[model samples]
Target chain A: SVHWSIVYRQLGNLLEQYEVEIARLKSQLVLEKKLRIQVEKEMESVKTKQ
Target chain B: SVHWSIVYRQLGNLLEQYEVEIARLKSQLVLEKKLRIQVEKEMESVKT
Candidate 1:
């Protein structure tokens, strides 16, 4: 993830690509965190049903 | 390629999303280089 998005814009195209990747990975991490929480809640609900 | 922007943050975000593709593209280029060299070497051997 970028230390700061502001400084990010000045990077050349080559480094820019890497910068983008970190962002994507960070987003993916967010998604995964949300999914894990959702699954945990769902699992708890299923346990109650059982 | 982005030259005009008051917000560096936004530009960074825009550029940040493509890193994976860039990495993948780099690897693809490397593979192509190897393949090209191989083909050229073979072509030189037989003139075919």
Candidate 2:
């Protein structure tokens, strides 16, 4: 019983860590997407001026 | 013992899935960065 409890807690912590990492990655992904869009728009406007 | 084995395998599988997801997200991130750089260069060249 003690062994199982320890294992359960460890797994819980590991899963929580993964969740945090995934959330951070997703947030970065969103920022990258927005930056890409912004840069693309800038490119379009620059081209239009030509 | 049997319970422990099952739990271990489940955890292994779950971790694998997370690894896959992280890899995929990172790959997309690299692509996004490359595309942004390309567009920014284009913008610069256009300005010049």
Candidate 3:
């Protein structure tokens, strides 16, 4: 087994990497939601017209 | 330095774990978007 401190650092490093991934994904999701909302408003406009 | 072969396998294992995490988050985001769309539609009905 690895030393506890060594393993801890290893996991911490991985967490940092995952944090980067989460940050990227969160921003992407936010953009997607904005686009979705815009499209939804467009949908409302179409419905209003029809 | 650790042998390159050993380090390669270790990194690969970590990546497999991360792949699982990415998949889970992807599904959760999709579900969230669907719910958001549903709620937005409801709002439209309320307004119109």
Candidate 4:
């Protein structure tokens, strides 16, 4: 019982850490999307001016 | 023992899924970076 309890606690912490990373990565992806849109728009406007 | 094993397996699967998602996001980021570079270059060229 003690052995399983110890392993359980460790796995719980590990999963929590992964969840945090997942959220961080998701936010970064969102930011990247916004940046892509802004850059693309600038390029389009530049082409129009020419 | 059985309960712990079940929970452990579920978590293992969940972690695997998250890893896959992270890899996909990373690949998308790389593509977006390349695209940004291309767009910026075009913008610069047009300005000059």
Candidate 5:
């Protein structure tokens, strides 16, 4: 088998990438939730006007 | 330093946990996106 240090380093790098992606996904989810809320509010306004 | 094998095993476990979390987050994101789309569509129908 190869050295453990190399494997450890690789795993660390992979974990960092995952962390970045997780952060991005979280931000996008937040924005999407906000958009949904805004759209719901607009729908309510339109219904009230109708 | 301690044995490399122990460190390797621990890292593997940690990676597995991250993988599970990533999967869960991805599923949640998909659901959130779908909900957003459905809400947008409803808004369009209301406008029409």
Candidate 6:
């Protein structure tokens, strides 16, 4: 018999790992988003300088 | 409602799918991320 079921303990572990990766991705995404906004602000300043 | 909510729905679905797929691929990516850390730390001898 297969030791684990469809949503068995092992699968639960899998869910956990994915959450970690996703969370990290989200944090990184937030930083990237902020940086992008800053860059746009700088571009706006340059546009005004012209 | 716009039929193109699919595009908006697309991402949420895609993210959901990504998680399901990610979880399905979980066997391959063990100890690779967070839920895993919990699995290992909390669950005893969690041999997948």
Number of the top-ranking candidate, with TM-score as the measure: 5
The residue ranges of model 6 lying beyond 4 angstroms of the native Cα positions read: A5-7, B1-48
What TM-score number comes out for model 2? 0.72
The residue pairs in collision within model 4 are none
lDDT of 2 by residue, A1-50 (tens): 47788987897898898888889999999998898898788778767776
lDDT of 3 by residue, B2-39 (tens): 88999868877876777687777788789768967786
Q: Write candidate 6's Cα lDDT for A2-43 as tens digits.
A: 665753666557657767777766665556555555655655
Order the numbered candidates by TM-score, best leading.
5, 4, 2, 3, 6, 1
Pairs that collide in candidate 6 are A16-B35, A17-B35, A17-B36
TM-score of every candidate: 0.37, 0.72, 0.51, 0.73, 0.79, 0.47
Name the runs in model 3 displaced over 4 angstroms: B1-27, B32-48
Clashes of each: 6, 0, 0, 0, 0, 3
Residue B38's lDDT within candidate 6 is 44
- Model 4, B20-46: lDDT tens digits are 877887788788778777777777777
- Per residue, candidate 1 scores C-alpha lDDT tens digits across A1-50 of 66765553456655755766656655655565555556556555655675
True contacts kept of each: 0.13, 0.58, 0.08, 0.55, 0.71, 0.05
Which segments of candidate 1 are over 4 A away from where they belong?
A: A1-50, B1-13
lDDT of 1 by residue, B1-48 (tens): 665675767756756656556666556555655655554454455433
Specify the poorest-scoring 10-residue window by lDDT in model 3 chain A. Answer: A38-47
Q: Runs in model 2 with CA error above 4 Å?
A: A1-4, B1-13
Cα RMSDs, all models: 19.7, 3.9, 9.1, 3.2, 2.8, 18.1
Please write out the lDDT profile of model 2 over residues B5-38, one tens digit for every residue. 8977887999889888888988998998888888
State which docking tier applies to candidate 3.
incorrect
Docking quality level of the chain pair in candidate 4: medium
lDDT over C-alpha atoms for residue B43 of model 2: 73
- Between the candidate structures 4 and 5, which one is better when assessed by DockQ? 5
